[PDB]
Amino acid sequence: QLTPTFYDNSCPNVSNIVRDTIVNELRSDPRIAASILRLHFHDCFVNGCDASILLDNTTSFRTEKDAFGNANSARGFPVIDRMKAAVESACPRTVSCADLLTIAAQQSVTLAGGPSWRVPLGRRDSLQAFLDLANANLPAPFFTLPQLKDSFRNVGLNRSSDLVALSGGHTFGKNQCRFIMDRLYNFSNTGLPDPTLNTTYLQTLRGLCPLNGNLSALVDFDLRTPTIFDNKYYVNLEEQKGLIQSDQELFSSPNATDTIPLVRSFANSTQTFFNAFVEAMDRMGNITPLTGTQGQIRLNCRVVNS
Numbered sequence: 001q002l003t004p005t006f007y008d009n010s011c012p013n014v015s016n017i018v019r020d021t022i023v024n025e026l027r028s029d030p031r032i033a034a035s036i037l038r039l040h041f042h043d044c045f046v047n048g049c050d051a052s053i054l055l056d057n058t059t060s061f062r063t064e065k066d067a068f069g070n071a072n073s074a075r076g077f078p079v080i081d082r083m084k085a086a087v088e089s090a091c092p093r094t095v096s097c098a099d100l101l102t103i104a105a106q107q108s109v110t111l112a113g114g115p116s117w118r119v120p121l122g123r124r125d126s127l128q129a130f131l132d133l134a135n136a137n138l139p140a141p142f143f144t145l146p147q148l149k150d151s152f153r154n155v156g157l158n159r160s161s162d163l164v165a166l167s168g169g170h171t172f173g174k175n176q177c178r179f180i181m182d183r184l185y186n187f188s189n190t191g192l193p194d195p196t197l198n199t200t201y202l203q204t205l206r207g208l209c210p211l212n213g214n215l216s217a218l219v220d221f222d223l224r225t226p227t228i229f230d231n232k233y234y235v236n237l238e239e240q241k242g243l244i245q246s247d248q249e250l251f252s253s254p255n256a257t258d259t260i261p262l263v264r265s266f267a268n269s270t271q272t273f274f275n276a277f278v279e280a281m282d283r284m285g286n287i288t289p290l291t292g293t294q295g296q297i298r299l300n301c302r303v304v305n306s
């Protein structure tokens with residue numbers, strides 16, 4: 001059983017050390033909080049939150065960093081190394097990389113203006129990485145709502161509230177032009193833009209992501225408050241201004257009878273969204289953790305102890 005007080009005696013200042021690291025980093029990289037939250041999500045959706053994503057290549061197993069959903073996309077690894085080193089100095093061989101990343105995600109959300117809460121702790125680190133599983137389990141922006149639901153159910157999150165709330169992670173952060181080119185110029189082989197994309201916003205996005213342009217160019221997930229963690233993400237959806245297909249489908253999919261009321265509830269109330277986000281975050285953070293004597297307390301998050 002994971003518990004929020006797991007380190008209250010062994011490393012009482014772990015959350016503060018993690019917070020300090022993110023605060024400093026945010027001055028040079030305003031995108032780091034979003035990036036870290038995403039790392040935690042990518043950790044939990046592949047064999048659970050066991051820091052498997054933090055492992056680098058070895059001659060026996062490939063790193064998840066080369067997965068389609070991570071390669072040239074996931075970022076912030078050096079920052080995690082930094083806080084891990086700072087925590088190792090404060091409390092040697094005590095805090096697992098899995099827990100560190102979980103705390104880092106929560107602190108990132110809070111620092112960005114989101115809710116503040118104590119995440120359950122006690123997770124341990126994996127002894128291997130899972131590239132194939134990462135390629136199979138990470139959802140793609142072109143997924144239909146049924147596919148998005150299936151992807152979450154696959155890892156243990158059955159509730160549509162889990163999906164709608166966690167999708168709120170797109171209240172900040174960046175997205176490459178490559179992931180919306182179809183919506184802008186040729187959606188579903190129609191030669192036309194995605195009809196669920198607001199036409200005014202369509203023009204704006206086409207200007208940022210011209211056909212035959214730099215597909216790596218970055219666009220804000222939330223046009224209202226690009227770097228603030230709030231419920232504006234949902235207000236955008238109600239106006240057909242969700243950035244990627246998977247965002248807008250929560251409100252426009254023919255299968256959205258159950259997600260629409262959730263989108264509206266979160267758009268109508270910050271408290272309702274924040275409460276749901278915390279509940280969903282803890283549920284995701286509870287996915288198949290290694291505990292007790294299972295796995296290890298990695299000293300270097302990039303490699304298994306030797």
Ligand code: HEM
Pocket residue numbers: 031034035036037038041072073074075139140141142143148166167168169170172173174175176179244246
């Ligand atoms: C529901 C399915 C989801 C899909 C299909 C999806 C898709 C994407 C895509 C395409 C990107 C852009 C990557 C890039 O341009 O390199 C991205 C970024 C991001 N996602 Fe999601 N995502 C999903 C769920 C989530 C969840 C559950 C969270 C966390 C609670 C999350 C948090 C983020 C954040 C914060 C970023 C920006 C990261 C940065 O700027 O470094 N995503 N997502």
Ligand SMILES: [Ca+2]
Pocket residue numbers: 042043044045046047048049050051052053
């Ligand atoms: Ca993992």
Ligand SMILES: [Ca+2]
Pocket residue numbers: 171172222224225226227228229230231232233
């Ligand atoms: Ca926002």
